[PDB]
Amino acid sequence: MADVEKHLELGKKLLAAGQLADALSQFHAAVDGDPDNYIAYYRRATVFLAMGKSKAALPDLTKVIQLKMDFTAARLQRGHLLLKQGKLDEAEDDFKKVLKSNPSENEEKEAQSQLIKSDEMQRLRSQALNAFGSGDYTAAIAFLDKILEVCVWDAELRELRAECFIKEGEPRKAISDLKAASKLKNDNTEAFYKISTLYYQLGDHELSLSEVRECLKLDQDHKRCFAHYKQVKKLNKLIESAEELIRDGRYTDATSKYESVMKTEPSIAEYTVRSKERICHCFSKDEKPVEAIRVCSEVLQMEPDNVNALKDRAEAYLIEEMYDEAIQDYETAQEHNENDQQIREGLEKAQRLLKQSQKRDYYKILGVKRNAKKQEIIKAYRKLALQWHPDNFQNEEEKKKAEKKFIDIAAAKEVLSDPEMR
């Protein structure tokens, strides 16, 4: 009908304008209106492909083919797709029938180049699995890395490689594949669960949560997903809230939410380690030096390179006027993060005070200002020197201590006469 014509035409304009989502809407309308119009099926597949929707394109393309078996450009299209999906054998059968069908000169060049690739894919697949079967994981990765340049939408193999990075002790390198695999399979809940937990495991709670919400959108009654859901949702509030508080500068509150974070997930180290960094942060930003040093130091026993923990402990040491240990920290921090304005401003501001503290102040032996007025000093000296005379002290060890204060008071008067003021 005219409708199916309008759907296709608006479909066309939209696609051309890059408007994939609504183009798809319209071809959907076009397919429903005339369920036997190969053009509708073809134009939809064309969008699906444009959108990365690998699974959805295939049944539409083979429909186009079922209806119009002479239409070889759709057979070549389905050829390409299946080769992306890593359904090699079938990708070969189409690429070959394309060649047996008076192809275009550009259709011959494609159908051929592809079979050439496909041949290597079959060898690389077999090497990949074989490597994997014997436990040669780094071997398997190298093969698979190559297959997946070409088979970019082989979910199964992506999964295998993720499993490789994992056995290798490199879990984070498996986020891409596992995320990809769930995207392609589209309505497989297990794929969302796997990616949701791998995220959780890495302390990626925000994603993990959103990613399991997907599982449950697919299956409301999925037991395992829901269990995990309760879990990360709980741990998400606690962490989100913890940080809300840290920005309000409610540090002891923040610290309490973090103790809850750790109590809610004890098994995974990252949730314990990262909580401690944040607690270390709370204490330091709260001017609680001994507590900062105690917690921050423990964080560094676990992660000696923790730039954030070093900055917070540095800050603690500054409070304690521990200028050496502050620089040592700001420095060992500067090693791991090369140019940080905060680190550098810390190292200079620590050094300035390390210098100024070694610089003896005769006024610091009593003077009201860097300029105590007139005979205020003479009043201070006579009393102090008379107070602090080793004669005063019967205790031998106590005396020797007065003496240093006496030499100090005396050396003060000596330098506070006439020109020696500067």
Author numbering: 34 to 455
Question: What does the original paper state about this entry?
Answer:
P58IPK (58-kDa inhibitor of protein kinase) is a member of the endoplasmic reticulum- (ER-) localised DnaJ family of proteins (ERdj proteins) which interact with BiP, an important regulator of the functions of the endoplasmic reticulum (ER) (recently reviewed by Otero et al.). In this study we present the structure of human P58IPK, including the BiP-binding J domain. The crystal structure reveals P58IPK to be an elongated protein, with the J domain attached to the very end of the TPR domain via a flexible linker. From the structure we can identify the probable binding site for BiP based on the position of the conserved histidine-proline-aspartate (HPD) motif which is necessary for Hsp40-Hsp70 interactions.
Finally, it was found that using this optimised condition to crystallise native protein, after enzymatic cleavage of the His-tag, yielded crystals that looked very similar but diffracted in space-group H32 (crystal form 2). These crystals provided the dataset used to refine the structure at 3.0 Å. The two crystal forms are very closely related. Crystal form 1 (P312) has one chain in the asymmetric unit and crystal form 2 (H32) has three chains. If chain A of crystal form 2 is superimposed on the single chain in crystal form 1, chains B and C are shifted only 2–4 Å and 1–2 Å, respectively, from symmetry-generated chains in the other space-group. The structure in the two crystal forms is very similar, with root mean square deviation (RMSD) of 0.8 Å (using chain A from crystal form 2). The three chains in the higher resolution structure of crystal form 2 show RMSD of 0.4 Å between A and B, 0.5 Å between A and C and 0.7 Å between B and C. In this crystal form, the density quality is highest, and B-factors lowest, in chain A, while B and C have weaker density. Due to the high density quality of chain A, all analysis is based on this molecule unless stated otherwise. The linker between the TPR domain and the J domain (particularly residues 402–408) and a loop in the J domain (particularly residues 425–428) show highest flexibility, however even these regions are relatively well resolved in chain A of crystal form 2, which enabled model building. PISA suggests the oligomeric state to be monomeric in crystal form 2, but identifies a potential trimer, generated by the crystallographic symmetry, in crystal form 1.
